[PDB]
Amino acid sequence: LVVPNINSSNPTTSNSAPALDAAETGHTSSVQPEDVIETRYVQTSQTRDEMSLESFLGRSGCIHESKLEVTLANYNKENFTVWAINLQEMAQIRRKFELFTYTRFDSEITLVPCISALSQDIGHITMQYMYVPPGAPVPNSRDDYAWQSGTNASVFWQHGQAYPRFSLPFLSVASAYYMFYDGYDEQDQNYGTANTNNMGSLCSRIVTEKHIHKVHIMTRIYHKAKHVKAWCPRPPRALEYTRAHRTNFKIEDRSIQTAIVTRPIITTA
């Protein structure tokens, strides 16, 4: 994917003024170097490959950190987690995608387990991760039947096994995911992307039966987008994010702080 080259130009002195236009139209004055300066002739090499959407969102980043604390005593009644799925929880990522109104793509999920030891030894740990779609039964105990997973998609990780990973087809019941959404509920409530982006929940639960060591499992979640398309670009974000599925920004007794630096005077930068 190439960039045009720059042609040599010459001292014009014409009746036509390409430099002069009117931005009122809403068009970006199409003027090029040549038209304004006796220019050289250059054979540009430069390539825009990298600037492709596929190269942009084509990088894996983190979207969630799920910390699970093991508890000896009542083992089978806890030691499990849940999670409302979405990208809305981690600036870095979110800021990007929130660069377009609508987007479509498949996803590559990658997991990263970390066992923080609390006794002198760890023993043998084994996790399980189940994808529970909206409508499916949520687990409620480290021993709930749901973890049988007769149909949901689960992935098992044990200690010393390389990071797991899997691919996911574009979900949603639409043509694309809604990054934003000026709409409500059928009960005029919940203004926001929350109104739609219900992908279900992601749960984990230590499998290893009752044992002797207190430990902490911290599984981070990474996500790369593949086969992409996006529509209607939007201006990028400017203030720290506060809450999921909402644009809100005003924060508890603190000034509205952008990223624009200030200066003393405009006749010196």
Binding site: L1, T47, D106, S167, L168, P169, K226, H227
Partner: peptide, 25 residues
């Protein structure tokens, strides 16, 4: 099948759409 970039081989080993690597342009 193998191609040119910015040669090499690459067939999709997986039976499904999504599993494939990154797209082309």
């Amino acid at each position: 099948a193998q191609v040119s970039r910015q040669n090499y081989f690459n067939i999709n080993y997986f039976k499904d759409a999504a599993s494939n690597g990154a797209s082309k342009l």
